[PDB]
Design a protein around this motif. Sequence first.
Motif, PDB file in Angstrom:
ATOM      1  N   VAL A  38       1.129  -1.061   0.025  1.00 33.08           N
ATOM      2  CA  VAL A  38       0.178  -0.198  -0.075  1.00 33.08           C
ATOM      3  C   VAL A  38       0.728   1.081   0.373  1.00 33.08           C
ATOM      4  O   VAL A  38       1.771   1.199   0.498  1.00 33.08           O
ATOM      5  CB  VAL A  38      -0.739  -0.323   1.421  1.00 33.08           C
ATOM      6  CG1 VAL A  38      -1.784  -0.921   1.072  1.00 33.08           C
ATOM      7  CG2 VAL A  38       0.059  -0.332   2.464  1.00 33.08           C
ATOM      8  N   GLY A  39       0.032   2.247  -0.137  1.00 35.26           N
ATOM      9  CA  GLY A  39       0.815   3.894   0.274  1.00 35.26           C
ATOM     10  C   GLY A  39       1.317   4.280  -1.490  1.00 35.26           C
ATOM     11  O   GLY A  39       1.282   3.692  -2.881  1.00 35.26           O
ATOM     12  N   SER A  40       1.268   5.787  -1.847  1.00 35.47           N
ATOM     13  CA  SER A  40       1.728   6.656  -3.252  1.00 35.47           C
ATOM     14  C   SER A  40       3.055   6.850  -3.147  1.00 35.47           C
ATOM     15  O   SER A  40       3.387   7.569  -3.925  1.00 35.47           O
ATOM     16  CB  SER A  40       0.949   7.564  -2.649  1.00 35.47           C
ATOM     17  OG  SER A  40      -0.149   7.375  -2.039  1.00 35.47           O
ATOM     18  N   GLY A  41       4.215   6.317  -2.425  1.00 34.03           N
ATOM     19  CA  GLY A  41       5.190   6.519  -2.711  1.00 34.03           C
ATOM     20  C   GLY A  41       6.550   5.244  -3.509  1.00 34.03           C
ATOM     21  O   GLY A  41       5.431   4.493  -3.556  1.00 34.03           O
ATOM     22  N   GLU A  42       7.375   5.675  -3.639  1.00 39.55           N
ATOM     23  CA  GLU A  42       8.492   5.254  -3.841  1.00 39.55           C
ATOM     24  C   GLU A  42       8.988   4.615  -3.389  1.00 39.55           C
ATOM     25  O   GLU A  42       9.484   3.577  -3.697  1.00 39.55           O
ATOM     26  CB  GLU A  42       9.155   5.545  -6.114  1.00 39.55           C
ATOM     27  CG  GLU A  42       9.600   7.030  -4.692  1.00 39.55           C
ATOM     28  CD  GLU A  42      10.443   7.610  -6.367  1.00 39.55           C
ATOM     29  OE1 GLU A  42      11.716   7.869  -6.833  1.00 39.55           O
ATOM     30  OE2 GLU A  42      10.118   7.735  -7.706  1.00 39.55           O
ATOM     31  N   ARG A  43       9.717   4.763  -2.717  1.00 37.26           N
ATOM     32  CA  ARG A  43      10.422   4.111  -1.478  1.00 37.26           C
ATOM     33  C   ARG A  43      10.085   3.119  -0.461  1.00 37.26           C
ATOM     34  O   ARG A  43       9.075   3.447  -0.356  1.00 37.26           O
ATOM     35  CB  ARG A  43      11.206   5.122  -0.021  1.00 37.26           C
ATOM     36  CG  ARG A  43      12.164   5.664  -1.036  1.00 37.26           C
ATOM     37  CD  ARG A  43      12.821   6.684   0.029  1.00 37.26           C
ATOM     38  NE  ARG A  43      13.223   7.953  -0.409  1.00 37.26           N
ATOM     39  CZ  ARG A  43      13.849   9.242  -0.228  1.00 37.26           C
ATOM     40  NH1 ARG A  43      14.700   8.375   1.305  1.00 37.26           N
ATOM     41  NH2 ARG A  43      14.596   9.580  -0.520  1.00 37.26           N
ATOM     42  N   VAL A  44      10.657   1.627  -0.974  1.00 33.71           N
ATOM     43  CA  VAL A  44       9.807   0.691   0.075  1.00 33.71           C
ATOM     44  C   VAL A  44      10.327   0.649   1.462  1.00 33.71           C
ATOM     45  O   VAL A  44      11.528   0.951   1.499  1.00 33.71           O
ATOM     46  CB  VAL A  44      10.156  -0.404  -0.597  1.00 33.71           C
ATOM     47  CG1 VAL A  44       9.816  -1.941   0.002  1.00 33.71           C
ATOM     48  CG2 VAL A  44       9.709  -0.715  -1.637  1.00 33.71           C
ATOM     49  N   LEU A  45       9.198   0.365   2.083  1.00 32.25           N
ATOM     50  CA  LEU A  45       9.337   0.746   3.402  1.00 32.25           C
ATOM     51  C   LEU A  45       8.745  -1.251   4.229  1.00 32.25           C
ATOM     52  O   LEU A  45       7.427  -1.144   4.010  1.00 32.25           O
ATOM     53  CB  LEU A  45       8.664   0.979   4.646  1.00 32.25           C
ATOM     54  CG  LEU A  45       8.461   1.325   6.080  1.00 32.25           C
ATOM     55  CD1 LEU A  45      10.429   1.151   6.617  1.00 32.25           C
ATOM     56  CD2 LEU A  45       7.130   2.102   6.750  1.00 32.25           C
ATOM     57  N   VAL A  46       8.746  -2.078   4.504  1.00 31.66           N
ATOM     58  CA  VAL A  46       8.388  -3.348   5.418  1.00 31.66           C
ATOM     59  C   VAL A  46       8.233  -3.153   6.761  1.00 31.66           C
ATOM     60  O   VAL A  46       8.897  -2.785   7.622  1.00 31.66           O
ATOM     61  CB  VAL A  46       8.651  -4.684   5.107  1.00 31.66           C
ATOM     62  CG1 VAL A  46      10.512  -4.809   4.167  1.00 31.66           C
ATOM     63  CG2 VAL A  46       9.186  -5.307   6.125  1.00 31.66           C
ATOM     64  N   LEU A  47       7.053  -3.181   7.251  1.00 29.76           N
ATOM     65  CA  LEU A  47       6.782  -3.725   8.522  1.00 29.76           C
ATOM     66  C   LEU A  47       5.964  -4.919   8.835  1.00 29.76           C
ATOM     67  O   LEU A  47       5.501  -5.715   8.595  1.00 29.76           O
ATOM     68  CB  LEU A  47       5.330  -2.546   8.997  1.00 29.76           C
ATOM     69  CG  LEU A  47       5.461  -1.219   8.826  1.00 29.76           C
ATOM     70  CD1 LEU A  47       3.717  -0.363   8.351  1.00 29.76           C
ATOM     71  CD2 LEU A  47       6.589  -0.023   9.304  1.00 29.76           C
ATOM     72  N   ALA A  48       6.785  -5.386  10.278  1.00 33.59           N
ATOM     73  CA  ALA A  48       6.562  -6.548  10.292  1.00 33.59           C
ATOM     74  C   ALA A  48       6.365  -7.410  12.373  1.00 33.59           C
ATOM     75  O   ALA A  48       7.476  -6.616  12.486  1.00 33.59           O
ATOM     76  CB  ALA A  48       8.301  -7.381  10.344  1.00 33.59           C
ATOM     77  N   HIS A  49       5.560  -7.492  12.047  1.00 26.98           N
ATOM     78  CA  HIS A  49       5.447  -8.203  14.004  1.00 26.98           C
ATOM     79  C   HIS A  49       5.428  -8.821  13.997  1.00 26.98           C
ATOM     80  O   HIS A  49       6.395  -9.442  13.665  1.00 26.98           O
ATOM     81  CB  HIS A  49       2.820  -8.024  13.367  1.00 26.98           C
ATOM     82  CG  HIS A  49       2.881  -9.366  12.524  1.00 26.98           C
ATOM     83  ND1 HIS A  49       2.792 -10.436  13.420  1.00 26.98           N
ATOM     84  CD2 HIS A  49       2.635 -10.015  11.652  1.00 26.98           C
ATOM     85  CE1 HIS A  49       3.381 -11.609  12.551  1.00 26.98           C
ATOM     86  NE2 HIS A  49       2.508 -11.043  11.461  1.00 26.98           N
ATOM     87  N   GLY A  50       5.553  -8.498  15.589  1.00 22.46           N
ATOM     88  CA  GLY A  50       6.163  -9.804  16.269  1.00 22.46           C
ATOM     89  C   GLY A  50       5.060 -11.053  17.122  1.00 22.46           C
ATOM     90  O   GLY A  50       3.953 -10.880  15.637  1.00 22.46           O
ATOM     91  N   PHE A  51       5.334 -11.819  17.570  1.00 23.05           N
ATOM     92  CA  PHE A  51       4.767 -12.659  18.422  1.00 23.05           C
ATOM     93  C   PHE A  51       3.582 -12.116  18.523  1.00 23.05           C
ATOM     94  O   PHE A  51       3.756 -12.095  19.966  1.00 23.05           O
ATOM     95  CB  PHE A  51       5.504 -13.999  19.104  1.00 23.05           C
ATOM     96  CG  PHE A  51       5.087 -14.460  20.825  1.00 23.05           C
ATOM     97  CD1 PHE A  51       4.490 -15.457  20.402  1.00 23.05           C
ATOM     98  CD2 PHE A  51       4.404 -13.648  21.506  1.00 23.05           C
ATOM     99  CE1 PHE A  51       3.883 -16.464  21.584  1.00 23.05           C
ATOM    100  CE2 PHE A  51       4.115 -14.382  22.372  1.00 23.05           C
ATOM    101  CZ  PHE A  51       3.939 -15.991  22.568  1.00 23.05           C
ATOM    102  N   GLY A  52       2.128 -12.939  18.791  1.00 25.52           N
ATOM    103  CA  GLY A  52       1.036 -12.385  18.949  1.00 25.52           C
ATOM    104  C   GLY A  52      -0.122 -11.835  18.802  1.00 25.52           C
ATOM    105  O   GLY A  52      -0.815 -11.652  18.675  1.00 25.52           O
ATOM    106  N   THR A  53       0.537 -10.904  17.584  1.00 26.19           N
ATOM    107  CA  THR A  53       0.117 -10.180  17.018  1.00 26.19           C
ATOM    108  C   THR A  53       0.354 -10.034  14.900  1.00 26.19           C
ATOM    109  O   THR A  53       0.580 -11.684  15.064  1.00 26.19           O
ATOM    110  CB  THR A  53       0.425  -8.946  16.571  1.00 26.19           C
ATOM    111  OG1 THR A  53       2.401  -8.893  17.192  1.00 26.19           O
ATOM    112  CG2 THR A  53      -0.073  -7.719  18.228  1.00 26.19           C
ATOM    113  N   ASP A  54      -1.178  -9.653  14.138  1.00 22.70           N
ATOM    114  CA  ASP A  54      -0.822  -9.618  13.110  1.00 22.70           C
ATOM    115  C   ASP A  54      -0.041  -8.449  12.111  1.00 22.70           C
ATOM    116  O   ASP A  54      -0.297  -7.701  13.222  1.00 22.70           O
ATOM    117  CB  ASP A  54      -2.064 -10.870  12.311  1.00 22.70           C
ATOM    118  CG  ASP A  54      -3.090  -9.603  12.409  1.00 22.70           C
ATOM    119  OD1 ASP A  54      -3.074  -9.033  12.451  1.00 22.70           O
ATOM    120  OD2 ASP A  54      -3.642 -10.342  12.933  1.00 22.70           O
TER     121      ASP A  54
END
Length: 262
Positions: free
Chosen positions: A11-27
Amino acid sequence: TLLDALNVRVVGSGERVLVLAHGFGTDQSAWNRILPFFLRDYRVVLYDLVCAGSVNPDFFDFRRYTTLDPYVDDLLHILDALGIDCCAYVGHAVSAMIGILASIRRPELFSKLILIGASPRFLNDEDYHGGFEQGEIEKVFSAMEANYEAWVNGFAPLAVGADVPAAVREFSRTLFNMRPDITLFVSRTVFNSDMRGVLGLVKVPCHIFQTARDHSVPASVATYLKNHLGGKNTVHWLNIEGHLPHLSAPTLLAQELRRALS
């Protein structure tokens, strides 16, 4: 099919990639409140670890996910499939470590790692304070197995730390989504790993986000990482209480992310 199974979303309108990675117990929904701060400057990549209750449990193969390696494999598969040749990576708790390990295998893929509530080792030994004794950890596993619901109700407020009821509930429900089975197995996998010997192999800059009173990460574990990660390291001492600041103080945490990313 792996992108589908792991709920990969771009998702998003930018071109630079950002990844968000959850921890244990969430999604990946744990990032819901952070996300708005990044949609316009970034192409944001989110996914769920196989152990998230939001992923079909048929995909959690107990004969495969015995260590962090296959978690790393999954991450690296996602990134290759999306044609990502470089990104910034934000990982919470176990995903901090998964990020570390991925960076070591593919240092060209990451411009920057951002670690939130990371630890290379929960167990204490001779010269290392990780926060937990062998006894303690076992009493957790037996509490989880004996009565899973009672465990969630006692663990969630501690993990969140600060008095933010909305957050306690949100963490509770994603823990509840997980099949007790898998929560037990994954916890064993994690509480028993020692990542200390890998830190010096990291060459990518790391920003170490550390909250006050994090129940699973003593303040000294943040310094330890700063001292052992082999690249250029910055510690961010968040004015936030708890282990899950993305749920409990999302505006505050987003502002620090934005700063670390520039």
